Amino acid sequence: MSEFNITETYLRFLEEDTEMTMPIAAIEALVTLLRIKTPETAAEMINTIKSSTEELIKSIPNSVSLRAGCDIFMRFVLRNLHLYGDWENCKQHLIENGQLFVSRAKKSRNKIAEIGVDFIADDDIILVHGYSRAVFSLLNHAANKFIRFRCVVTESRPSKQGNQLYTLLEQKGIPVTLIVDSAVGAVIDKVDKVFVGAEGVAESGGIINLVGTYSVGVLAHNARKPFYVVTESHKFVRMFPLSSDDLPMAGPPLDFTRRTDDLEDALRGPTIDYTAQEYITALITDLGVLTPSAVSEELIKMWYD
Amino acid sequence: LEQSFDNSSLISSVKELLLNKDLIHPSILLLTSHLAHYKIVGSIPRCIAMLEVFQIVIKDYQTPKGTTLSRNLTSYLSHQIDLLKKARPLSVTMGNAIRWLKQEISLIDPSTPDKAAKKDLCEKIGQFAKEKIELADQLIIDNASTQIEESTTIVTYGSSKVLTELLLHNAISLKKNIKVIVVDSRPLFEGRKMAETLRNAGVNVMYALITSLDTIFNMDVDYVFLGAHSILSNGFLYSRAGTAMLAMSAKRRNIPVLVCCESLKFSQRVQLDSVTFNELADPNDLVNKNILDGWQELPSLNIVNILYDLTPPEYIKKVITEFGALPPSSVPVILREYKGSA
C-alpha cells in the first residue's frame, strides 16, 4: 500500500517515459492519491491532498513547475468540489472525472501545434532557448507540414539543455546551428522570430524558466523582433514576483563566500530569472493565442475568491 | 496661425525683376528660370550648373572704363547672385563655392591685362570643379565601394547626387551583384531620374513610394545610403524631405544607414529642430477642374510643403567623406582641420 509522497509513487513513473514532464507527473500522482485513498469523508481527503502537495513541494523546491501542477490540482479539486453533489456522488463523480487530465493534458501538446504552426511562416530563422519540449512539439508538426524555415539554438549554461535540441531536430532534418548563449546580441539583428518556453507564468505574464530568458527578451525588445513563448495550460502558477529575482535557490543570487579547496564555481549566480510582461508579446496555450493581459485575466479570475 | 510657420520669411516669393540697373547675363536668366520653374537639380548639380555658368559670365568680361578688374567683379557677380537668390534659396554648395570664388577674386593683383584673367580664373575654377567636386567624388566611390558585399540591396532616397555613380560602379565596373531600391516622394519625383539611369544601365532597380515604406524593410534589406544637401555642425543631416522617416525606420529595424557626402558640403551653422531654417516650395504643386482649386478664397485652409528636414545624428551610422569614414558626432573636426585648409 503506497503512500504517494516522494518516490513510492511519484518518481517511479518518471523513469517510465522521458516524454512526460514534471507538472503533469504531479497531476497524475495527485489524482492517483485520492483515486485509491478515499476514506468516505470530505474532511480528511482535502487534508491528505494538501499535506501531499506541501510535502511534494518540500521535496524539490527549485522546480516551480511542480508548484504550478500541485496548485492547479487544488483548483481542480475545488471546482470539482463545486457543483455541490453532497459528496454522495462526488466520491465517485470526482474520481470518474479523475483521469480526464491524463487523457487531456497528455494530448495537449499537439493541440499546441494545431494553433501554433500558423506562426512560423516561410523562411523564418528561429531562435529557441532551452529544452522546452512544447516548442519542439510545435516545430515537429511545423516540419511535418513541409514549411521552410531555419533554427538557431542557444546554450543553456549551466543547465546543459541547449545541447539537446541540436541532437533532437537535426535528425528530424532541419538546418540548425548551435549558437553560444552570449552571442545573442550579434545575431538577433538577423533572427526573424524568437521562441522560448516557460516553467511558469506569473499574474501578469512572466517567464520563470531558465538562466537568461530576461537577457534574450531584452535583446528581442532592442532588436524589435517578436518574442513569443510556447507553453501549455498546466503552467499557471500563483507566484507573482516584482523584481527580476524570484524565490532563492538556497541563498541570494550574489554570493560572496570563499571557495574552500576546489568546489564548483559556475553555478554561483542565479539560475531562474524573470521576464516582465512588456518583453513577451504573445503566448501560446491550449486556450488559443493569448496576449499577456489575457493571461493576466485568466490567472486573475481562477485565483481570487 | 496656431504655429504660424507658413509665414516664415526665409524664402520670398516675389518675381519679375524688370530693373535694367546691371548687365544681367542672359545665360544666368536661363539658369534661374531653369532652377525655379521646373526643378531639375539636387545640390551638386546646382553647384556644377552655377559654377559652369559663372565660367561663362567671367569669360564674357566687358569691363567698364575706369574701373580695374579687381574692383568691380565682386559687386557685379553679387548682383548676378541676387537673381538666383530670388529664384531659389542657396545650398551650402552654392555658398562654399561663392565665398571661395570671392576670396580668389580678392587675391588678384592690378596688373592683369584681361587676357591672363582667363588663365587664372577659368582654369582655377575648373581646378575647383575638379578637386573639390569630381575627384573628391572619385574618392567617395573608391572609399565606399569596399563597404558593400556582393548580392545585397541598397535603399537610396530621392535623386542621389554622388552615389548614382557608386551604384553604377558597383553594378557594372565591379560586377558584384546588387539590388537597388529607389524610393522618392511627392512632388519632385526625382527618384525616377535615378531609376531611369540605373535601369538603363542594367541593374535590378525596384522603385517604390515612401507611403509604402514599411514593406520595403520587411524584405531582405540592408545598407541604406542617403544623399546629403548639407551636414550641420552637430551631426544633424540636412537633405530632401522624407529622408528622416526612412532614416528612423532604418535605425529602428537595426540595419545600417550611410551618408555619402564631401568636405565641400559641411556647414558652419547649427540647428537641432527641423522646422527652424527651411524652404517653403510653391504650394500649387501639391494639386496635380482639378481635385481642389483655390486654397485661397476659402477661409481656413492652407497647403504647406517642406523641402528640407533633419535626421538626428543617432540614426546615421556612418558619414563617409573623401578623407575617410567618420561618426556623425565628429563632423566639427573636419569643419576645423580640413575644410578650407585643403
UniProtKB/Swiss-Prot annotation, chain A:
It is found in: Cytoplasm, Cytosol. Disruption phenotype: Inhibits GCN4 derepression in glucose, amino acid, or purine-starved cells. It comes from the Eukaryota. SUPFAM superfamilies: NagB/RpiA/CoA transferase-like (SSF100950). Its main location: cytoplasm. Gene3D superfamilies: Translation initiation factor eif-2b, domain 2, Translation initiation factor eIF-2B, N-terminal domain. The modification N-acetylserine is found at residue 2. One of its GO terms (molecular function) is enzyme regulator activity. The modification Phosphothreonine is found at residue 291. GO terms for cellular component: cytosol; eukaryotic translation initiation factor 2B complex; guanyl-nucleotide exchange factor complex. GO terms for biological process: cytoplasmic translational initiation; positive regulation of cellular response to amino acid starvation; positive regulation of cellular response to heat; positive regulation of translational initiation; regulation of translational initiation; translational initiation. Keywords: Acetylation, Activator, Cytoplasm, Initiation factor, Phosphoprotein, Protein biosynthesis, Repressor, Translation regulation. InterPro entries: eIF2B_alpha/beta/delta, elF-2B_alpha_N, IF-2B-related, IF_2B-like_C, NagB/RpiA_transferase-like. Belongs to the eIF-2B alpha/beta/delta subunits family. Acts as a component of the translation initiation factor 2B (eIF2B) complex, which catalyzes the exchange of GDP for GTP on the eukaryotic initiation factor 2 (eIF2) complex gamma subunit. Its guanine nucleotide exchange factor activity is repressed when bound to eIF2 complex phosphorylated on the alpha subunit, thereby limiting the amount of methionyl-initiator methionine tRNA available to the ribosome and consequently global translation is repressed. Component of the translation initiation factor 2B (eIF2B) complex which is a heterodecamer of two sets of five different subunits: alpha, beta, gamma, delta and epsilon. Subunits alpha, beta and delta comprise a regulatory subcomplex and subunits epsilon and gamma comprise a catalytic subcomplex. Within the complex, the hexameric regulatory complex resides at the center, with the two heterodimeric catalytic subcomplexes bound on opposite sides. Present with 8970 molecules/cell in log phase SD medium. This is Translation initiation factor eIF2B subunit alpha. The gene is GCN3.
Curated annotation (Swiss-Prot), chain B:
GO terms for molecular function: enzyme regulator activity; translation initiation factor activity. It comes from Saccharomyces cerevisiae (strain ATCC 204508 / S288c). It comes from the Eukaryota. Belongs to the eIF-2B alpha/beta/delta subunits family. Component of the translation initiation factor 2B (eIF2B) complex which is a heterodecamer of two sets of five different subunits: alpha, beta, gamma, delta and epsilon. Subunits alpha, beta and delta comprise a regulatory subcomplex and subunits epsilon and gamma comprise a catalytic subcomplex. Within the complex, the hexameric regulatory complex resides at the center, with the two heterodimeric catalytic subcomplexes bound on opposite sides. It is found in: Cytoplasm, Cytosol. Acts as a component of the translation initiation factor 2B (eIF2B) complex, which catalyzes the exchange of GDP for GTP on the eukaryotic initiation factor 2 (eIF2) complex gamma subunit. Its guanine nucleotide exchange factor activity is repressed when bound to eIF2 complex phosphorylated on the alpha subunit, thereby limiting the amount of methionyl-initiator methionine tRNA available to the ribosome and consequently global translation is repressed. Keywords: Acetylation, Cytoplasm, Initiation factor, Phosphoprotein, Protein biosynthesis, Repressor, Translation regulation. GO terms for cellular component: cytosol; eukaryotic translation initiation factor 2B complex; guanyl-nucleotide exchange factor complex. GO terms for biological process: cytoplasmic translational initiation; regulation of translational initiation. The chain holds residues 247 to 651 of 651 of the full protein. Present with 10300 molecules/cell in log phase SD medium. This is Translation initiation factor eIF2B subunit delta. The gene is GCD2.
